[PDB]
Write a protein that binds this ligand. Structure first.
Ligand SMILES: [Zn+2]
Ligand SMILES: [Zn+2]
Ligand SMILES: [Zn+2]
Ligand SMILES: [Zn+2]
Ligand SMILES: [Zn+2]
Ligand SMILES: [Zn+2]
Lengths: 425, 425, 425
């Protein structure tokens, strides 16, 4: 059922307010399915038929199904996605006290659209690092309830509001979380300490640092007269993580299947744990002999880089090429850009397109208007052929994005077919 | 305590997506409390101690509680508010069919902030006028389900989105409600016919015209670390309708109490339907003898004109006068403006300020900055002394506004004291 | 003594006018301390307790102390800095003869602030490549004495000078080094030939090419009423090279310690010998077995990326976030940017912050104002966890920068503690 898949997506989104939580949610499903967690510090002893996963920074995840045939001779079938989404992150000395409020200073992470973050019931989640019994450790928190808001200024006090103004992030985006009594101090670290106790039963000696993201408490939901759509934060790109996961868990065949979901894509993938890092490469090498084996394996592999595409928006149709306007619910989009903003080529495109035909999934094509500006990055790190595809969406980088409610099922089906395909060379 | 009043506010907002629904929700409460509906076409026979309400256009409502002393000799204690809120309304020939979608053309009603309407799960409600069995009639509909969305354009296709642009309402605000099959015709009036059957069991011969408002399906909610806040559409001015109602229904004493909630305030009033139409005057005259009575009664009356004020916003604090920055949860604000943008005067202010003190409710003062730019309308109709007050809020005319969670109780308390107050200035 | 450390810094800066000289100065201290130079062309035979260093391009240096425990099981403790600083470099056909002067045409290297280069007594140093007895070779030169000046134009001939104008580098930055007699030719290569003889006793057959940087002859100096400050060119980032070196040479414990100081950071680190090159990676791999060993080692390692931070400047305080304005002499700054302009995360931040606490060194936090723009690069090359820290400074990329005179000692102490720390996983 599309309906079961879509509900599964809504659940996953709800459990995944930050890249740490997305990674943990992926890990829980994998383990329930029998996948064994490996640690990058240990020597591994994997084998044919094994089901494994590994993480790095608790925010990037690689899932591995080793097939019957070795990667050396049959290659890997890889699906790539990303765990991060543009949002607001709490600063390290964040307490702002003004006009009787307590606010938290925020950085903008990734290319967020600012306006939609206003007038939303926000909570806060992510990683907290602390010392307990002279031991340094980390946990995830999620306050869950709506503790914050970034309100708009009344139109009465900003009469040209609808003219547009340059929203200044330093000044306009700090959320209000509380009011302070006369002479009441404010200690955010103390609030985190309370949350650690409440959520984990832990008392910290001291809260040191954290990576906390504001997020919307409004769950994702089906929308539309005929339930055509799905609305929710983080569709870019938890939509693809979830699809890629369902495809891996249900895939037939006995190929070598990889699900790589990396952090830091919204920011250029350049970290210890991003796609422009050697995470993927160092995991794959561990599944092969030394020498030429990795190079040979990779030239028999294909990466399907799954990241949301732009549907043609009816109130802004002129932002698309008239020949390449994807329809929501018209299936996955093959993304082409010969300037290598996407890595797709005629062979990767052709293979995917054929795969969609054999699976009876509709398929679409996108290029940008020629007067407008992980695929290329991972191709360039490990050298693997890549097709960039995505489900068509609107309002990418909003706090609440829109996709087609038929498209997840289309994508799970074709990814399932990819992962089961014994042929690529 | 009044988690009770707040939950009742949340419930009332949910049942009141349009002015028509707000009027119906007010009426259902008043009837539950014993108030009898009069009709403006009939001669009335009212009496001492009687509890009455009347409507006009099904969108404005006046509730009347007649005390023991005649209006002539003890005046009226009036509380004024309004039933309308800025929003988006369906055009009369609305169907727009483009890039495989069905959209509905919309007018902007009142001074709406455009941006917040984007990326929200919208439903649709209001009055439908139709012919059934040869006769003309009206019903309210509320689809309830989230059938519509106005999505943002991806930041990738609008890269200076955050620098601001002038949102064009004709082009960017039509909501998407569906996708159409190739050759599939779109008929909105037919969709209304189905909603009429579904919601009222009525089948129409022909659906003629309607006044339908899009609205947000996310309910109002308490927000903030210590539940300091309430967030929701239509606080302006359903917050005051609800407060006034509660005060009227619970007030002690013996006085002649009026609750006047008019439509069309957000567009200057100036319909048949108020507040500088003659609805209020024509109802009040009917409670008195002919002659000098109305004029005498009105000179012994006071109107407390309740409409939301602007709290000082900490991310935009220079938009207030530093001496006149109301705090959420700081209590009702007395609104002062010498150019009669508010009708408050030293006597109506002083009396209200005194009422708050005796009720132990905190009270605040607002004037605008002297370099920046309902009470006056109704004082100027009828001639009544007026104090303009309001609970302090943020983001007024957004789709989701913010108030203090303590302020509703504060307001109900003082309005109750006003209604029970045997003398005035 | 802070005083001995600071004098050591002043000496090191004086000996290090170019990245080649910085590298040579580091190498001389290391050798005096018993570190043995390895050559990247040779097979290495290193062992526990060994003290080694290697260079690449004579401008990047890696210093290695092998501990008792193998890197495989205890990881590396790495401190990263850079040998290069923004400056002016002589062009390859540089002789400009105009109005009786001889000038040298210059490129701007890195993001130099132009104005401060004017009206300074400059000398010239760096690498010269030549042929002597049919053999190609390189030496360093340093003219030492003040042979050049870039004078300002008199304010009298540029009366709006203080209004600001766009200093054109091609036209305004060539330094004057001499006056030419009527019909005297000018041969810069010949001058270099003389300098080779004078400085090294070498006669070249022909001077081919060179990488020569102008530099300030004014030594670094303590400044301030209470000697609070240190002023000098190249604090960014010879300040960190020097600190990192002192910490390595004095470190207790028996961990695996690395000091990586790379060239070309001011320009994006993208060279044979920069941090975006494989220098570091290829050295570290040589200290480990083949296979998974390097990956495992790296996931037990931590990089402390030490590069100067911005103190809050009292004449420009609004360029900082009010909550994150580091004080000179307030200790090292932990640099955070969730967009990965720094690689620090809650774990690397927390570990460093704790390390400062156990060492009794004050520690500070920096993020940028949210409306403003080697760590991430090396994390992304080798995959290592990284904390970006820096001593707070002013006037970065001037010819004369300012730091706190207490801060070097603070940084040496904490780096010493890092290098001696047996725990990170
Ligand atoms: Zn994406
Ligand atoms: Zn994105
Ligand atoms: Zn209002
Ligand atoms: Zn209004
Ligand atoms: Zn630097
Ligand atoms: Zn620099």
């Amino acid at each position: 059922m599309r309906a079961e898949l879509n509900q599964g997506l809504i659940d996953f989104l709800k459990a995944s307010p930050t890249p740490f939580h997305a990674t943990a949610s992926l890990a829980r499903r994998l383990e329930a399915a029998g996948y064994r967690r490996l640690d990058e510090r240990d020597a591994w002893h994997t084998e044919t038929g094994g089901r494994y996963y590994v993480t790095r920074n608790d925010s990037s995840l690689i899932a591995i199904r080793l097939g019957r045939r070795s990667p050396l001779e049959s290659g890997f079938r890889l699906v790539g996605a990303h765990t991060d989404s543009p949002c607001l992150r709490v600063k390290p000395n964040p307490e702002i006290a003004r006009n009787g409020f307590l606010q938290l200073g925020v950085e903008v992470y990734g290319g967020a659209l600012f306006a939609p973050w206003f007038d939303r019931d926000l909570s806060l989640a992510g990683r907290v690092t602390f010392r307990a019994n002279g031991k340094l450790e980390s946990r995830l928190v999620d306050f869950r309830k709506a503790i914050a808001v970034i309100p708009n200024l009344a139109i009465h006090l900003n009469r040209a509001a609808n003219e547009g103004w340059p929203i200044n992030a330093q000044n306009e985006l700090p959320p209000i979380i509380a009011q302070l009594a006369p002479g009441e101090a404010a200690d955010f670290r103390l609030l985190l300490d309370e949350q650690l106790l409440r959520e984990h039963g832990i008392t910290a000696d001291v809260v040191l640092d954290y990576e906390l993201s504001f997020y919307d408490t409004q769950s994702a939901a089906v929308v539309g007269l005929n339930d055509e759509f799905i609305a929710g934060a983080r569709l870019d790109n938890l939509l693809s993580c979830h699809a890629g996961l369902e495809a891996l868990l249900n895939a037939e065949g006995d190929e070598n299947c990889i699900l790589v979901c990396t952090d830091h894509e919204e920011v250029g993938s350049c970290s210890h744990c991003g796609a422009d890092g050697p995470f993927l490469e160092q995991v794959l090498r561990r599944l092969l002999p030394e020498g030429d084996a990795f190079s040979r394996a990779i030239q028999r592999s294909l990466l399907v880089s799954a990241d949301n595409a732009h549907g043609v928006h009816p109130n802004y149709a002129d932002r698309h090429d008239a020949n390449h306007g994807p329809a929501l619910n018209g299936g996955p989009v093959i993304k082409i850009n010969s300037n290598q903003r996407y890595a797709t080529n005629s062979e990767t495109a052709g293979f995917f397109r054929h795969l969609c035909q054999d699976s009876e999934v509709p398929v679409q094509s996108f290029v940008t208007r020629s007067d407008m500006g992980i695929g290329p990055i991972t191709a360039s790190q490990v050298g693997v052929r890549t097709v960039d595809i995505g489900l068509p969406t609107f309002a990418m980088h909003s706090i609440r994005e829109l996709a087609g409610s038929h498209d997840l099922a289309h994508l799970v089906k074709v990814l399932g077919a990819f992962y089961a395909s014994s042929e690529l060379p």
